[PDB]
Amino acid sequence: MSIFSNIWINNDLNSYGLSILLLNIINYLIVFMLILSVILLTNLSKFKSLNQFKEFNSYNFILYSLIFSLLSMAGIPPLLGFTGKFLAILYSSFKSQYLLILFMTILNIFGMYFYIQNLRFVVKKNKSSILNYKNYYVNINYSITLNIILLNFFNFFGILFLSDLIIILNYISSYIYI
Amino acid sequence: MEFSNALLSQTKLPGQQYDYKRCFQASNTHFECLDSIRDAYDNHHKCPQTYQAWQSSCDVGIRRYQMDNREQQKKDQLLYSKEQLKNYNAAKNKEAYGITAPKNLSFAF
Amino acid sequence: EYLTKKTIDSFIFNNNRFNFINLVESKYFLQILTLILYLFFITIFILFYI
Amino acid sequence: MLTWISFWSLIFWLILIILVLKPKNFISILFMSELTWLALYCLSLLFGAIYCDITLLSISFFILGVAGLEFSFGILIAILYKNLNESLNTDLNNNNNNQNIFDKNFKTPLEKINWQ
Amino acid sequence: MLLRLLVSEYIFFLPVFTNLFIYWHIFFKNNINLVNKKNNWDKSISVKNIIIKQNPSFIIRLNLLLNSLMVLYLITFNGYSSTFWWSHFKLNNYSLYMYLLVIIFNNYFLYITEKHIKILNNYSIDYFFSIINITLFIPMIFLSNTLFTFFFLIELVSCAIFYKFIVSKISFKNSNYKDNYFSIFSKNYLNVLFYQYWSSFFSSVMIGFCIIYLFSLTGSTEWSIINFIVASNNQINYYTNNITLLFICLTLIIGFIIKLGIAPIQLYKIEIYKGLPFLSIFFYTTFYFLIFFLFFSLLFIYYLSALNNFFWIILLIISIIGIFYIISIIFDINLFKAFLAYSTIINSISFILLIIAIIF
Amino acid sequence: NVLFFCTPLFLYLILQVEELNSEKRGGTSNKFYHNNAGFFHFQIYDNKQ
Amino acid sequence: SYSGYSLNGGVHPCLPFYERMLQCAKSEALPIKMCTAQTEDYLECHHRKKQYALNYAIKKELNNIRIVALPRYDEENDTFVPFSQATADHIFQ
Amino acid sequence: AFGGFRQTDNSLIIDDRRKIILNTRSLNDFQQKIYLRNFFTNYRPDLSSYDYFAFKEKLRIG
Amino acid sequence: LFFMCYELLLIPSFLIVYFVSPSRRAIQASLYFVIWTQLGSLLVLIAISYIISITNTYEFNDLKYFNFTNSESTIIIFLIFLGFGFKAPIWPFHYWLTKTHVEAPSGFSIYLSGFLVKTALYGFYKFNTSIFIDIDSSIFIAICIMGVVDSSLKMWGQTDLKKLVAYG
Amino acid sequence: RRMALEQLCYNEEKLERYQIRAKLQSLKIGEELSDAYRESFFEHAVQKNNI
Amino acid sequence: MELNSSAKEDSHYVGVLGYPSQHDPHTLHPKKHDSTFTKVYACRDMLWDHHWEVRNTLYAGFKGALLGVAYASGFGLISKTVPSIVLKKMFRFVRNNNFGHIRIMQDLLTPYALTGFGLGSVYYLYQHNVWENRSNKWLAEVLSNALFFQVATAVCVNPGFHIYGMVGGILFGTLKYAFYNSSFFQEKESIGSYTTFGDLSEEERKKQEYKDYIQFLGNYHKVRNGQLVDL
Amino acid sequence: SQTFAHDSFLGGLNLFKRRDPRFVLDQGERPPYPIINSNSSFVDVLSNFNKADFGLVLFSAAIGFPLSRWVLKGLTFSSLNYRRGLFSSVYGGVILWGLVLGFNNSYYRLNGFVDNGLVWKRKERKLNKYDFTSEFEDNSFFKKLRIRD
Amino acid sequence: SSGDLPSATLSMIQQGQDPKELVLQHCKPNCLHWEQKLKRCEAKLRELVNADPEMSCMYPLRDWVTCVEACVQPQIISQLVGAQKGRIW
Amino acid sequence: NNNLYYILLYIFLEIVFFGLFLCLYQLELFTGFLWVAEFAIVFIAVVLLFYLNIDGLHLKYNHNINNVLYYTPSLVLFLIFFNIDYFSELELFLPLELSFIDIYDDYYEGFNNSIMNDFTPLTLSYYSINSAEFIIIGLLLLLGSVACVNLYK
Amino acid sequence: GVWSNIHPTDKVTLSFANIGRPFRLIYRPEIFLRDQQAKFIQLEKEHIEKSKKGEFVETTSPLVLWN
Numbered sequence A: 001m002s003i004f005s006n007i008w009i010n011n012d013l014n015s016y017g018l019s020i021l022l023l024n025i026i027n028y029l030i031v032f033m034l035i036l037s038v039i040l041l042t043n044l045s046k047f048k049s050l051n052q053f054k055e056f057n058s059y060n061f062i063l064y065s066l067i068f069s070l071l072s073m074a075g076i077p078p079l080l081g082f083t084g085k086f087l088a089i090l091y092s093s094f095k096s097q098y099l100l101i102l103f104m105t106i107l108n109i110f111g112m113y114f115y116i117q118n119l120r121f122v123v124k125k126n127k128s129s130i131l132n133y134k135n136y137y138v139n140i141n142y143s144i145t146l147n148i149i150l151l152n153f154f155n156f157f158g159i160l161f162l163s164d165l166i167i168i169l170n171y172i173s174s175y176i177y178i
Numbered sequence B: 001m002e003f004s005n006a007l008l009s010q011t012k013l014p015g016q017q018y019d020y021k022r023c024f025q026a027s028n029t030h031f032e033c034l035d036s037i038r039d040a041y042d043n044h045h046k047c048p049q050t051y052q053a054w055q056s057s058c059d060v061g062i063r064r065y066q067m068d069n070r071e072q073q074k075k076d077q078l079l080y081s082k083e084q085l086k087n088y089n090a091a092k093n094k095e096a097y098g099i100t101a102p103k104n105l106s107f108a109f
Numbered sequence C: 001e002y003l004t005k006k007t008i009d010s011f012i013f014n015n016n017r018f019n020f021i022n023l024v025e026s027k028y029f030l031q032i033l034t035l036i037l038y039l040f041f042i043t044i045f046i047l048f049y050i
Numbered sequence D: 001m002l003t004w005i006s007f008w009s010l011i012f013w014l015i016l017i018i019l020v021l022k023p024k025n026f027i028s029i030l031f032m033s034e035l036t037w038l039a040l041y042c043l044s045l046l047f048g049a050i051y052c053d054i055t056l057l058s059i060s061f062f063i064l065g066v067a068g069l070e071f072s073f074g075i076l077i078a079i080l081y082k083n084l085n086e087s088l089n090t091d092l093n094n095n096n097n098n099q100n101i102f103d104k105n106f107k108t109p110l111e112k113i114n115w116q
Numbered sequence E: 001m002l003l004r005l006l007v008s009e010y011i012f013f014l015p016v017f018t019n020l021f022i023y024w025h026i027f028f029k030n031n032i033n034l035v036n037k038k039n040n041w042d043k044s045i046s047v048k049n050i051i052i053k054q055n056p057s058f059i060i061r062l063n064l065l066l067n068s069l070m071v072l073y074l075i076t077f078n079g080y081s082s083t084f085w086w087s088h089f090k091l092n093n094y095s096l097y098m099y100l101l102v103i104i105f106n107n108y109f110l111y112i113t114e115k116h117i118k119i120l121n122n123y124s125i126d127y128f129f130s131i132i133n134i135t136l137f138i139p140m141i142f143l144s145n146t147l148f149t150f151f152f153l154i155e156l157v158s159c160a161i162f163y164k165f166i167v168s169k170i171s172f173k174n175s176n177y178k179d180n181y182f183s184i185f186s187k188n189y190l191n192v193l194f195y196q197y198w199s200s201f202f203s204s205v206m207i208g209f210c211i212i213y214l215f216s217l218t219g220s221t222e223w224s225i226i227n228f229i230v231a232s233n234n235q236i237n238y239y240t241n242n243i244t245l246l247f248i249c250l251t252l253i254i255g256f257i258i259k260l261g262i263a264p265i266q267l268y269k270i271e272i273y274k275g276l277p278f279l280s281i282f283f284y285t286t287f288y289f290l291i292f293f294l295f296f297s298l299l300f301i302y303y304l305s306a307l308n309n310f311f312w313i314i315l316l317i318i319s320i321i322g323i324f325y326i327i328s329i330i331f332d333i334n335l336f337k338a339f340l341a342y343s344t345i346i347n348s349i350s351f352i353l354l355i356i357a358i359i360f
Numbered sequence F: 001n002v003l004f005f006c007t008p009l010f011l012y013l014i015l016q017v018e019e020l021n022s023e024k025r026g027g028t029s030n031k032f033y034h035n036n037a038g039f040f041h042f043q044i045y046d047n048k049q
Numbered sequence G: 001s002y003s004g005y006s007l008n009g010g011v012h013p014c015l016p017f018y019e020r021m022l023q024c025a026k027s028e029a030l031p032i033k034m035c036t037a038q039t040e041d042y043l044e045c046h047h048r049k050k051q052y053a054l055n056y057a058i059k060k061e062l063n064n065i066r067i068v069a070l071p072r073y074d075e076e077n078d079t080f081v082p083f084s085q086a087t088a089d090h091i092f093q
Numbered sequence H: 001a002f003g004g005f006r007q008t009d010n011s012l013i014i015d016d017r018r019k020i021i022l023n024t025r026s027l028n029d030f031q032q033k034i035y036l037r038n039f040f041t042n043y044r045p046d047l048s049s050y051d052y053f054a055f056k057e058k059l060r061i062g
Numbered sequence I: 001l002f003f004m005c006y007e008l009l010l011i012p013s014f015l016i017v018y019f020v021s022p023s024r025r026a027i028q029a030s031l032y033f034v035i036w037t038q039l040g041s042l043l044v045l046i047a048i049s050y051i052i053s054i055t056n057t058y059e060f061n062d063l064k065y066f067n068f069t070n071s072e073s074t075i076i077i078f079l080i081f082l083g084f085g086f087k088a089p090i091w092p093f094h095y096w097l098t099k100t101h102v103e104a105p106s107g108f109s110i111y112l113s114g115f116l117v118k119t120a121l122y123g124f125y126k127f128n129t130s131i132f133i134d135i136d137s138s139i140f141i142a143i144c145i146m147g148v149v150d151s152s153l154k155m156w157g158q159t160d161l162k163k164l165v166a167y168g
Numbered sequence J: 001r002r003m004a005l006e007q008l009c010y011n012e013e014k015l016e017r018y019q020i021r022a023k024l025q026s027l028k029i030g031e032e033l034s035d036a037y038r039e040s041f042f043e044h045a046v047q048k049n050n051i
Numbered sequence K: 001m002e003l004n005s006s007a008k009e010d011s012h013y014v015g016v017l018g019y020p021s022q023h024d025p026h027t028l029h030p031k032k033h034d035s036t037f038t039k040v041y042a043c044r045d046m047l048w049d050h051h052w053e054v055r056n057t058l059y060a061g062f063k064g065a066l067l068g069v070a071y072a073s074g075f076g077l078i079s080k081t082v083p084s085i086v087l088k089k090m091f092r093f094v095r096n097n098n099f100g101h102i103r104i105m106q107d108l109l110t111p112y113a114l115t116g117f118g119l120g121s122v123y124y125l126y127q128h129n130v131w132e133n134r135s136n137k138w139l140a141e142v143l144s145n146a147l148f149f150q151v152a153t154a155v156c157v158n159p160g161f162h163i164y165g166m167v168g169g170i171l172f173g174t175l176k177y178a179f180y181n182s183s184f185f186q187e188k189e190s191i192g193s194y195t196t197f198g199d200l201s202e203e204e205r206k207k208q209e210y211k212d213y214i215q216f217l218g219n220y221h222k223v224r225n226g227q228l229v230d231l
Numbered sequence L: 001s002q003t004f005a006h007d008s009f010l011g012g013l014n015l016f017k018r019r020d021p022r023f024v025l026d027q028g029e030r031p032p033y034p035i036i037n038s039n040s041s042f043v044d045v046l047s048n049f050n051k052a053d054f055g056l057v058l059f060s061a062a063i064g065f066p067l068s069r070w071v072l073k074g075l076t077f078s079s080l081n082y083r084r085g086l087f088s089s090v091y092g093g094v095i096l097w098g099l100v101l102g103f104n105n106s107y108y109r110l111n112g113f114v115d116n117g118l119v120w121k122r123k124e125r126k127l128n129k130y131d132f133t134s135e136f137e138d139n140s141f142f143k144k145l146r147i148r149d
Numbered sequence M: 001s002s003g004d005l006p007s008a009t010l011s012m013i014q015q016g017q018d019p020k021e022l023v024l025q026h027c028k029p030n031c032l033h034w035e036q037k038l039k040r041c042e043a044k045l046r047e048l049v050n051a052d053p054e055m056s057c058m059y060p061l062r063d064w065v066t067c068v069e070a071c072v073q074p075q076i077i078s079q080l081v082g083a084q085k086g087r088i089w
Numbered sequence N: 001n002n003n004l005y006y007i008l009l010y011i012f013l014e015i016v017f018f019g020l021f022l023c024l025y026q027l028e029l030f031t032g033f034l035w036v037a038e039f040a041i042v043f044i045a046v047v048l049l050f051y052l053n054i055d056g057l058h059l060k061y062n063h064n065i066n067n068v069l070y071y072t073p074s075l076v077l078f079l080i081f082f083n084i085d086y087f088s089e090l091e092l093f094l095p096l097e098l099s100f101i102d103i104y105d106d107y108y109e110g111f112n113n114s115i116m117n118d119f120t121p122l123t124l125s126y127y128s129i130n131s132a133e134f135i136i137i138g139l140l141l142l143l144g145s146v147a148c149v150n151l152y153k
Numbered sequence O: 001g002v003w004s005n006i007h008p009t010d011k012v013t014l015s016f017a018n019i020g021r022p023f024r025l026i027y028r029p030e031i032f033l034r035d036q037q038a039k040f041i042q043l044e045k046e047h048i049e050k051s052k053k054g055e056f057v058e059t060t061s062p063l064v065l066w067n
Helices: A016-040 A060-073 A081-092 A099-121 A144-158 A162-177 B005-010 B020-037 B048-057 B060-079 B082-096 C001-018 C025-048 D004-021 D024-053 D053-080 E013-030 E056-073 E093-119 E125-143 E145-166 E186-217 E223-236 E242-260 E267-274 E279-305 E305-330 E334-358 F001-027 G016-027 G038-046 G047-062 H030-037 H049-062 I001-007 I010-021 I028-055 I060-064 I071-088 I094-101 I106-130 I138-157 I162-166 J003-023 J037-046 K011-017 K036-046 K053-079 K084-094 K098-132 K137-157 K162-181 K202-219 K221-225 L011-016 L042-047 L053-073 L080-111 L134-138 L142-146 M020-027 M033-046 M057-079 N006-024 N028-052 N063-082 N107-110 N120-129 N131-152 O011-017 O023-027 O027-038 O038-053
Strands: A001-006 A007-009 E080-083 E089-091 G072-074 G078-081 H012-015 H020-023 K192-195
Touching: A001 H030, A001 K202, A007 E186, A007 O038, A016 A060, A016 A081, A016 A162, A016 E093, A016 E267, A016 E279, A016 I010, A060 A081, A060 A099, A060 E279, A060 O038, A081 A099, A081 A144, A081 E334, A081 O011, A099 E305, A099 E334, A099 I028, A099 K162, A162 J003, B005 B060, B005 E223, B005 G072, B005 I138, B005 J003, B020 B048, B020 B060, B060 G016, B060 J003, B060 O023, B060 O027, B060 O038, B082 L134, B082 O027, C025 D004, C025 E056, C025 E242, C025 E267, C025 E305, C025 N120, D004 D024, D004 N063, D024 D053, D024 E186, D024 N006, D024 N028, D053 E013, D053 E093, D053 E145, D053 E186, D053 I060, D053 N028, D053 N131, E013 E056, E013 E125, E013 L042, E013 L080, E056 E093, E056 E125, E056 L053, E056 L080, E089 E093, E089 E125, E089 I138, E093 L011, E125 E145, E125 N131, E125 O027, E145 E186, E145 E279, E145 N131, E186 E242, E186 E267, E223 E279, E223 E305, E223 G038, E223 I094, E223 K098, E242 L142, E267 E279, E267 E334, E267 H049, E305 E334, E334 K011, F001 H012, F001 I138, G038 G047, G047 I162, H020 K011, H030 K202, H049 K098, H049 K192, I001 I028, I001 I106, I010 I106, I028 I071, I028 I094, I028 I106, I060 I106, I060 K221, I060 L142, I071 I138, I094 I162, I138 I162, J003 J037, J003 O023, J037 K192, K011 K192, K053 K098, K053 N063, K084 N063, K098 K137, K098 N063, K202 K221, K221 N120, L011 L053, L011 L080, L011 N107, L053 L080, L053 N107, L080 N107, L134 L142, M020 M057, M033 M057, M057 N131, N006 N028, N120 N131, O023 O027, O027 O038
Parallel strands: none
Antiparallel strands: A001 A007, E080 E089, G072 G078, H012 H020, H020 K192
């Protein structure tokens, strides 16, 4: 935002921050959707306490998806969670907020520790049984499995496709002040 | 947001309404007169009748939006041309279909 | 070991001793009232004194 | 004594504070909420008088409806306390000791802790 | 108006009115589905059973279809950006995009919820009706043009949330045979109801006080005019009483934090999440994060940007206090629902810090 | 134990003394000597057609 | 949400000022710098801080002993005569 | 395009070539590049890019 | 790209540790290793974000075509050193490495010690050369010397072969 | 995505003048008439008032 | 709301813009015709003089006492669990007194107020006399705050929690450098503001600006890298 | 791009084609076509209904059968009378949605938001400086939805 | 190192010239109240005719000079050779 | 006081005093409406008190502990610094003889006004401008009634 | 491929290396530079015309833009 001979040149986009907040909220909501998706595919009465995380030790797809979602919640790379924290840090640096950067880093470290503390209770001595039984046999929702697969695909490798979402969010935020 | 001209123009008094048809007709007549004048600057006094009609029919905010759009359009028209824009867009798309290697071993700056 | 991780572990274990696990209604009401009153006092302190 | 605006604001703030000052009874909380809503309506009327604004005065009917909804919800909640086996005085539902209660005392419902 | 009423004044509200009418008619028809008189001249092929457990899948599908119809209507929408219904509604491209995004998210969540409901019917028709009604009015918040309409819509949303919380099943089918002659006193639902009601009362009182104080300051509660007047005060210095502005800003921020359950006021939300169904928790998170949090962010960024010079200190102090007080609490949870609530609180605090950075 | 815990401070002081001595005789100092202007060692520097 | 109406069902006293201020705000591309006069008039109409300050100044001046007796007024002539002018209906005669 | 970081030094900076005065705390990205980031960090800064690369290779060889 | 690739290796290492280690105590060891690696990654990411925001370009040649201020260079160097030393490992951020080498599977520990430390060193060297710094390297030199001294001194008390190899 | 890119380019072109006007409106109290801002203030208030 | 705006003032830009400066003298100079009461009351400018070390120390001590009283009122006394017998005796005294509430409040809050006043005075003296000659503002503030807070933590809370006190002091010093020392979000001047001098002509200014903008063309990476197509 | 002829049985397809993804236009922007009556009343909007609205209502009624069947597929343990009543109510809601869409289309046509057989005297000249979709839509069905690309 | 690199700038001190005039011109705006007081004192002195010899604007002139030189003197003092602060403190 | 019946009596007295204050400000219509609403609410509350607190024995709570511990200093601090009055002045600030705005009358406006009821502002607000707010209030009331029925069930 | 055919830079870079930068300059820099040099181009043309008449605008002498 400099002025040269009464003609100004702007190299900054004022709508980037709103798009950044929207993308962070969207990523958090998407992670929460997959986090609760596994709960929806199991007997929701079998997961009560924090130590009741070994109930996730089941058929390999459930365990792998749960581990990936737990990692994504803490924002570790290269899941969708790391994208939000990295973009927030980049925006804060672009706004020259060193104290805010330090506080965000401390908070992210504390959150990573809290989220990873649950991974300790993941191990179980044997395969668990948290699936509801229909017609005398355990019922697995194929539609829920497909939704969880799509979410896991968009989280594990969705970092490469971040360009289109970022462009869409920037376009949305462009008319916020216009 | 406080200095947003569009946001300020969007507001109106309680019960205030805008006659879009009349405003657009008067604006079209005034802008046709101005284009017939064909000047870089918007000398509204060159068509006193058309300027008066634009002032009476179009509100302050509508007139401001129209003037800003006209100024931007005039700048763009004096800037580029249709064939040049089309060729540049085609070349840019073709380049985006490739990769931009780093400018190693430069000779400036 | 003691300097790098035990410090944080002890800080957490000690600060947790001053926090109630199950929220009480009186605790919540007092917390809201104290938040409002002390935030107003602190904000006014910077405006006039700090 | 004090100017009307200052008196009304101070009364609203004091009522908000006193809502927590008294003991923890649901009925008392509902009564205090009703009093606070009435004070808010009075403040809105005084402000509409000060500024002569129609929208400011229009709040009283909306404020009255909101207060009625809140009072009905509170009455329904208090009625439900009977089936939940929870005393109206919320301090009796927590085992944490407090110096405000003169007679609080809870013991395990057993006869002899050590049998022989 | 008094003389003529333009169509655009309620053209947007017309689809909302149609959806509300359809939903109300359907819900009323579901209330008498078991009252079917049989005449003495009619034949019953099979014996009628009055014990009916209708899956709320039908209500979920109907609500999803209505939301899709609303999305289609918004897709074909066209016009000019202005104020609607006596400047009480804001119809901007950004507001329309926000409404569309909220509707899409609600539709995806409703599809997931219906798929989960087809597995085990642990939810009743009332919960689905409450969700549909909440979804009916949730998108309207983005179109608010004044703090009075925003307060009314937020009060309506809070009432819908309380109603949905009341729709939670108290008893469940369990194989616990040892408890057949003993009474188990569970106070989770009562605690959730009490906490929600008290927090809603306090937040509504704060928001009403803030609106009443703001109206006296400038004479209007609209979005753009308030910002213009506030920025003018910084240039004309007519009102130098920074104490009143600080008090109004503090009241607004405290009310928003209380409604959103922002730290250090977090034990309320912790207790709220500890006594609700999983689908109810999912719905509450989707509502709070997508609507309440984004609305608070826009209020601190787009609505009250002219007062951002004052909100900065309060926001920074609140963030520091939350970071200092929640870190110790975040390492002592022993419930999955408490862990989810703590994750939501941490994300909210991080987003608050990000918004504080953005306001610079 | 005191010497071990204070060893980093003693090491820092010794390093500072050695750096001062090197500055006295103009020797190699504990400084980021960016003499390559950022060009990496044996980094292929070719242009693309 | 500007009502602009009076408590008697009429028009709020600041309605024309608000109209002029809105016109100025929608007119200037930089009304923040340009709408100073209209903004000041609207602010004075809404919050009469200027009137309160003038009243405070008048009270401070009355705390002084400069003025003893103001000239009385006779409405039959619609004219002000000095306090020493011994006219009819005066408190002292 | 090269950006910049806002400086915190509440120090006045005097420029006589344009006969101007600017604050270290209040300076644009271009001003920081031209006055604060204009420091030299190369042995032969007057050489071109390829010239300096060749000079570095020759200095290592020497 | 360099930072993204450097950050991706943590997930495979955590997956290997959580699922292949035979020791029961390896759960807390894997958690601590993940935590330390994430802390180092966060420091490196903060430094990289600062560098990228300072100059909106993604080329080392463009980085050389720009000069960082004194405070900027000091902060960048300190953050890069902190991240790389947490990933080196360096004293006293070597508890994670010690516990990992104590508890991790033999193949993973061979790969973790052999490769990850070298990758972190290579990243630190690449970033450091691309940034000109006028500060004194006394802090980093002293840190390295003290870490070497501490690691060497503890060898006489190590009866576990894996622990002694880790200290070396 | 392509349509949104085109629309965002147009929106940014529109918002270009918004930033300039806000910075002119963000001039400090008394800085509007300053020599470094006098030219911009005169152009925006006198020349750019043609509605 | 600005923090330490008196210190954070651009004197040159303030003088150029003509805004009234807090650095100007705010004092009274009565003439040789006033009454004795007027002359005596004119001494109040001493309380408005910031150069008086006694005045600065007294103001800082008052601020510290107020902070301690606020801490005790908000979190201090409510956290404490006094013995029941003491409370009973206090209530008996309150019944038998005319203004017993004031006496009880004084007996309660006196230690916190005294400790706060003393700590504030000590911190003000240390800051104004020990850390005013350093070069690096961030480093000096960090060192001073860390030392003071670690010393306080070892003395006020407990000797054991010294590391936590030192970390808190470091954080407080960092926050003070960020906001109380730097005009972050408290700027009194527009970004990029420059004041011209030298009586340079308009043509010379235009030529210099064109030359500078030619360098501004070098700011674009693609312009520097020459990766632009012809349009 | 050409537009479906107004007042036909396929006028609703014009509401499915837009020049830009902008939900609303600016306060001072000229409409794509001439404006018939900006100050439109409810009675005027009702009088503005035509064969386009009739065809939209017919399409809503036709499509409403599959949506009603899908909704009814989720009902269990309900009487045939109840199922028939619910299906009839759903079909009525679909028809009402179609009527609302037709009324909105008529209002847009009277306001000139969509094509209504009218063309402005002087076309607004817009130069597509950023054009990354012309080629993309030129070789697919995406052109049929983009009015004038 | 930084010290072995060529110098990219040369100020007035590095040019061996006295920048005292430029320093005074730059620091005059900082001291305006003192200048106004000195002008008022000079006007009062010129208003009076053959006043008492114990009536001079010398005190105001000293105040103005102290205000002006309080900033100009130290700043140039920072740019002099041999004025480096030292190694540690 | 902790007795619920005495608390209710004090609330009724406070409501009466608020109505008197409103009448003093010449707002008798809203005063009467509030008085009626509060009387109905008080009747409902008395019924509830007879239902749930027939005995009336309040909990044995002592105000001294909480009052002396935090409440008194907190109230002192809050009242000490909170002042949101910018330009409000007392009626005795200036002599009433210097005020003449209440004497001017708009005879033509009165001749052009046909209003005979004080409910004109209420109608113009809750029917013309805030019609959206009125509709929202109605929908909220319907939803609250449904929620109360569900809670009773 | 298709997901990366809109910009000459990788998607990861464009998402990460464009932090609040003007998207017009990021995607189509040439038009952005031409628009930023709108009045500059007119001034250069005026100076060239004046020099064609023998009037060298030394103030506009630096205004010789290639792109």
